[PDB]
Design an enzyme around this catalytic site. Structure first.
Site, mmCIF file in Angstrom:
data_model
loop_
_atom_site.group_PDB
_atom_site.id
_atom_site.type_symbol
_atom_site.label_atom_id
_atom_site.label_comp_id
_atom_site.label_asym_id
_atom_site.label_seq_id
_atom_site.Cartn_x
_atom_site.Cartn_y
_atom_site.Cartn_z
ATOM 1 N N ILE A 14 90.791 -51.214 52.526
ATOM 2 C CA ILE A 14 91.194 -51.462 51.113
ATOM 3 C C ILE A 14 90.858 -50.222 50.279
ATOM 4 O O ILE A 14 91.131 -50.239 49.069
ATOM 5 C CB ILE A 14 90.511 -52.725 50.565
ATOM 6 C CG1 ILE A 14 89.012 -52.709 50.805
ATOM 7 C CG2 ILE A 14 91.158 -53.985 51.137
ATOM 8 C CD1 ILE A 14 88.277 -53.844 50.122
ATOM 9 N N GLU A 85 81.037 -57.735 46.676
ATOM 10 C CA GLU A 85 81.945 -58.875 46.405
ATOM 11 C C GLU A 85 83.378 -58.333 46.447
ATOM 12 O O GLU A 85 83.576 -57.134 46.141
ATOM 13 C CB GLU A 85 81.625 -59.502 45.050
ATOM 14 C CG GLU A 85 81.645 -58.495 43.905
ATOM 15 C CD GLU A 85 81.843 -59.109 42.533
ATOM 16 O OE1 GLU A 85 82.734 -59.973 42.395
ATOM 17 O OE2 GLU A 85 81.108 -58.722 41.602
ATOM 18 N N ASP A 90 92.411 -52.403 41.796
ATOM 19 C CA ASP A 90 91.770 -51.596 40.747
ATOM 20 C C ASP A 90 92.744 -51.381 39.583
ATOM 21 O O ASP A 90 93.959 -51.469 39.775
ATOM 22 C CB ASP A 90 91.285 -50.239 41.238
ATOM 23 C CG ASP A 90 92.395 -49.275 41.596
ATOM 24 O OD1 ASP A 90 93.102 -48.805 40.680
ATOM 25 O OD2 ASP A 90 92.556 -49.018 42.797
ATOM 26 N N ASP A 131 81.306 -41.883 35.802
ATOM 27 C CA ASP A 131 82.600 -41.676 36.437
ATOM 28 C C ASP A 131 83.515 -42.855 36.142
ATOM 29 O O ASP A 131 84.265 -43.294 37.027
ATOM 30 C CB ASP A 131 82.545 -41.501 37.945
ATOM 31 C CG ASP A 131 83.743 -40.746 38.505
ATOM 32 O OD1 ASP A 131 84.515 -40.143 37.690
ATOM 33 O OD2 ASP A 131 83.899 -40.738 39.736
ATOM 34 N N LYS A 133 86.616 -44.468 35.212
ATOM 35 C CA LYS A 133 88.038 -44.169 35.229
ATOM 36 C C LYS A 133 88.743 -45.385 35.803
ATOM 37 O O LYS A 133 88.081 -46.265 36.351
ATOM 38 C CB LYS A 133 88.365 -42.962 36.102
ATOM 39 C CG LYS A 133 87.732 -42.981 37.487
ATOM 40 C CD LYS A 133 88.057 -41.715 38.281
ATOM 41 C CE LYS A 133 87.485 -41.726 39.658
ATOM 42 N NZ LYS A 133 87.698 -40.448 40.347
ATOM 43 N N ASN A 136 88.182 -46.894 39.297
ATOM 44 C CA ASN A 136 86.829 -47.358 39.613
ATOM 45 C C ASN A 136 86.539 -48.669 38.895
ATOM 46 O O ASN A 136 85.383 -49.061 38.816
ATOM 47 C CB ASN A 136 85.736 -46.362 39.192
ATOM 48 C CG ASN A 136 85.583 -45.203 40.153
ATOM 49 O OD1 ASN A 136 85.859 -45.361 41.343
ATOM 50 N ND2 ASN A 136 85.141 -44.044 39.682
#
Ligand SMILES: COc1cc(Br)ccc1O
Ligand SMILES: COc1cc(Br)ccc1O
Ligand SMILES: COc1cc(Br)ccc1O
Ligand SMILES: COc1cc(Br)ccc1O
Ligand SMILES: COc1cc(Br)ccc1O
Ligand SMILES: COc1cc(Br)ccc1O
Lengths: 302, 262
Positions: A14, A85, A90, A131, A133, A136
């Site tokens: 993934i 989890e 995203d 970080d 973005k 993420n």
């Protein structure tokens, strides 16, 4: 560490990263779907990576609905498996999947609100994300968004001391990092969320620079070239140059045209040049933009 | 004041106070340590001070590493010939956590005089991680001190450096210091430093923040006051040497006060 790789059944890959590869797996006893992030200590040339040491130690105490939950760490001598989890997608893929539909204002609002809760929680537990973005931020089918990848995160002290430079993926990097300031704080995370806010609206990055200096220049052309008035100290900053072009600040309604009065108010405060004036995650929770916020499910599927 | 996180400083303080109780070692672990002593620990920690100077590491790193060692030794029984391997792995882990630029593993093997191998240091790194269950983000005396420092009217470098110095002296002596929490030593150290340099005392404002008074700080203060007086004579001297340096305003050269009028 009540876990064993023998109760997991790999499903598919993934994601991937320096750490290594992420797979979706299924717990064969409980049914729980997890993400397994594998760190190849195999490359033990220097032992356990500092990035993994920070990620694990910091995520073990960051328990919040809008921070991805570390469930377990399986610790062979050869390999290290982080059990997280499982979230379906995203935010960057969703924004692509939402191409010419747009993301509905209720969902932007909900997502920004949740991002602010999670970042506020990080900040209240001495953790800088560094970080933030779209790639993420993980979303579920239930309307949740959660901060993830704490590989670049860092436990700060009060007041802060000098930390690693040129942090944050460039497009989301705060100007005080671009200008080589000795010190940076929680404000850099806020900056990142500001970029993401604008990006959830337009589905395009706000400051897509190709270099540090192109980045600064993109910022300056939009919010204006900062001076001693808007931002005391700026002209003294290590990588401030007097020869910088002086661009006028364009009217903020033009930075993100579909955005309403409240939205623009909030955005401007996330993108204030001066880290001292820039809004906190905590104060931003109270902004009028959120007066009517709900938590709808994502309108599309995985 | 964003560098001083105004919106989160109390949240952070409250959080650290909770965490320091969870990251606390067993005050009486050396008695259950068959083969090592407070004296051997003092030697190890003194050494770690030198390593920190050698590699120009942060003071936070030193505090972290000591925290890791005392928690490991609270549950893991260690032979005297292995005490240094624990300490080296502690310092490596602490560096990977806290430093922008950690020393390479090879460098850690080097400072042990090839007592140990790169395999042994790495194998111990894993063991320490398993024993600590990765719980490395531990509140240190420093993280308290820096917050207390915001309460000076006005800031005074001599006060700050000397507080740091006193707090570092406490790492050396498991007895008595294992019985006091980071937030309490820092408070002792701050008052001692402040008193010594400016004659001033624990401010009302820090009473507000912490709940601690000179009343509640008294035990620790009495200990720290002794440690300060007897420091020229202590068998371990690396911290005094370090705090001669101008970096720290040569505070180790200041004369401790003869009484605390406390
Ligand atoms: C001890 O078990 C653990 C659990 C988690 Br979550 C992280 C690290 C561990 O070591
Ligand atoms: C089949 O269980 C496993 C799944 C993964 Br992913 C890695 C090791 C295993 O043993
Ligand atoms: C969708 O990709 C991911 C999902 C999770 Br949960 C963790 C890491 C990933 O890379
Ligand atoms: C720091 O680098 C630069 C500065 C200016 Br002004 C223009 C172009 C550059 O490449
Ligand atoms: C024998 O090993 C030792 C280790 C340390 Br640390 C101090 C004294 C010793 O004798
Ligand atoms: C045996 O010698 C030593 C042992 C330790 Br632990 C630290 C420093 C030393 O010199």
């Amino acid at each position: 560490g009540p876990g064993s790789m023998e109760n997991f059944q790999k499903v598919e890959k993934i994601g991937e990263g320096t750490y290594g590869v992420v797979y979706k797996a299924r717990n064969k006893l409980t049914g729980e779907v997890v993400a397994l992030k594998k760190i190849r200590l195999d490359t033990e040339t220097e032992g356990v990576p500092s990035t993994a040491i920070r990620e694990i130690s910091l995520l073990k105490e960051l328990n919040h609905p809008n921070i991805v939950k570390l469930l377990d760490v399986i610790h062979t001598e050869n390999k290290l498996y982080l059990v997280f989890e499982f979230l379906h997608q995203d935010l960057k893929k969703f924004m692509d999947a939402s191409a010419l539909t747009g993301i509905p204002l209720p969902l932007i609002k909900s997502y920004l609100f949740q991002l602010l809760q999670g970042l506020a929680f990080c900040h209240s537990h001495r953790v800088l994300h560094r970080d933030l973005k779209p790639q993420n931020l993980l979303i579920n089918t239930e309307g949740a968004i959660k901060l993830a990848d704490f590989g670049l995160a860092r436990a700060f002290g009060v007041p802060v001391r000098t930390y690693t430079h040129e942090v944050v993926t460039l497009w989301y990097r705060a100007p005080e990092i671009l200008l080589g300031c000795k010190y940076y704080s929680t404000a850099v995370d806020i900056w990142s969320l500001g970029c993401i806010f604008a990006e959830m609206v337009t589905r395009r990055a706000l400051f897509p620079g190709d270099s540090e200096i192109d980045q600064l220049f993109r910022i300056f052309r939009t919010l204006g070239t900062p001076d001693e008035v808007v931002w005391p100290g700026v002209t003294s900053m290590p990588d401030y140059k007097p020869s910088f072009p002086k661009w006028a600040r364009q009217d903020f309604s033009k930075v993100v045209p579909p955005l309403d009065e409240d939205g623009r108010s909030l955005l401007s405060q996330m993108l204030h040049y001066d880290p001292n004036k820039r809004i906190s995650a905590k104060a931003a929770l109270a902004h009028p933009f959120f007066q009517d916020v709900t938590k709808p499910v994502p309108h599309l599927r995985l | 004041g964003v560098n001083e996180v105004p919106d989160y400083h109390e949240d952070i303080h409250t959080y650290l106070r909770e965490m320091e109780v969870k990251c606390k070692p067993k005050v009486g672990y050396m008695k259950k340590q068959p083969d090592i002593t407070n004296s051997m620990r003092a030697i190890l920690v003194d050494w770690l001070v030198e390593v920190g100077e050698e590699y120009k590491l942060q003071n936070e790193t030193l505090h972290l590493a000591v925290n890791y060692i005392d928690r490991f030794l609270s549950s893991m029984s260690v032979l005297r010939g292995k005490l240094q391997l624990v300490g080296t792995a502690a310092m490596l882990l602490a560096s990977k956590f806290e430093e922008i630029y950690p020393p390479e593993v090879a460098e850690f093997v080097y400072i042990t005089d090839d007592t140990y191998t790169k395999k042994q240091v790495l194998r111990m790194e894993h063991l320490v991680l398993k024993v600590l269950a990765f719980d490395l983000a531990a509140p240190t005396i420093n993280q308290f001190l820096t917050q207390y420092f915001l309460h000076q009217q006005p800031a005074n470098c001599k006060v700050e450096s000397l507080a740091m110095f006193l707090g570092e002296l406490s790492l050396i002596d498991a007895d008595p210091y294992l019985k006091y929490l980071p937030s309490v030593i820092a408070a002792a150290a701050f008052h001692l430093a402040l008193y010594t340099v400016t004659g001033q005392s624990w401010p009302e404002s820090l009473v507000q923040k912490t709940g601690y008074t000179l009343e509640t700080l008294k035990p620790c203060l009495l200990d720290l006051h002794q440690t300060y007086l007897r420091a020229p004579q202590h068998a371990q001297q690396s911290i005094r040497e370090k705090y001669k340096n101008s970096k720290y305003h040569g505070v180790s050269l200041l004369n401790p006060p003869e009484t605390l009028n406390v």
